[PDB]
Amino acid sequence: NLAVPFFTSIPNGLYPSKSIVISGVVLSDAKRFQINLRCGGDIAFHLNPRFDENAVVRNTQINNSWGPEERSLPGSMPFSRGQRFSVWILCEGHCFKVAVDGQHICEYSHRLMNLPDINTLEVAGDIQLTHVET
């Protein structure tokens, strides 16, 4: 079942060289969607395209408190309403590397380093989810 909100395990948690791939289609009336890599009560990595803001927000939530957002992009907004997408998240020792449709869009330095405990993937929001690899 690929209904959203979608949850699944990341076997063995995160470690350097582990890849997560999220494929789907942005809804034509989308406001936002989110991909969360969760550990317990924290969100290690929140990847959050916002179509009203024309932004891709990255952040971390610890004990229910959000940190400072990261929003830098090398070019234009890499998701579009109604458009198919493939998100590739690569875990390294110091950061996540994120590509969309093969285009590198950002690095995000780890704020939570307990990588094996980051063992739940959540995908939620205004998309049709078509494939997950964890």
Residue numbers in the entry: 12 to 145
Anything the authors wrote about it?
Galectins are multi-purpose effectors acting via interactions with distinct counterreceptors based on protein-glycan/protein recognition. We report here the first crystallographic information on the N-terminal extension of the carbohydrate recognition domain of rat galectin-5, which is precisely described as an N-tailed proto-type-like galectin. The overall fold in ligand-free and -loaded rGal-5 is composed of two antiparallel β-sheets (F1 to F5 and S1 to S6 strands) that form the characteristic β-sandwich structure. The presented data shows that the N-terminal extension can adopt an ordered structure and shapes the hypothesis that a ligand-induced shift in the equilibrium between flexible and ordered conformers potentially acts as a molecular switch, enabling new contacts in this region.
Differences are attributed mainly to the N-terminus, and the six protein monomers can be divided into two groups, based on the experimental electron density. In the first group (chains A–C), the 11 residues at the N-terminus are not visible in the electron density map. When inspecting the second group (chains D–F), the electron density for this peptide stretch was clearly observed: the three amino acids from Ser2 to Ser5 form an extra β-strand, named F0, running in antiparallel direction to the C-terminal F1 strand. Residues Thr6 to Asn12 are in a loop, placed in parallel to the axis of the β-sandwich and protruding more than 10 Å from the S1 and F0 strands. The conformation within this loop is stabilized by interactions with symmetry-related molecules: hydrogen bonds between Pro9–His142, Tyr10–Glu103 and Asn12–Gly52 as well as a water bridge between Asn12 and Asn74. In the ligand-free structure, a network of water molecules or the presence of a single glycerol molecule takes the place of the core of a cognate glycan in the preformed contact site. As observed in the hGal-9N structure, a short β-strand is formed in the ligand-free rGal-5.
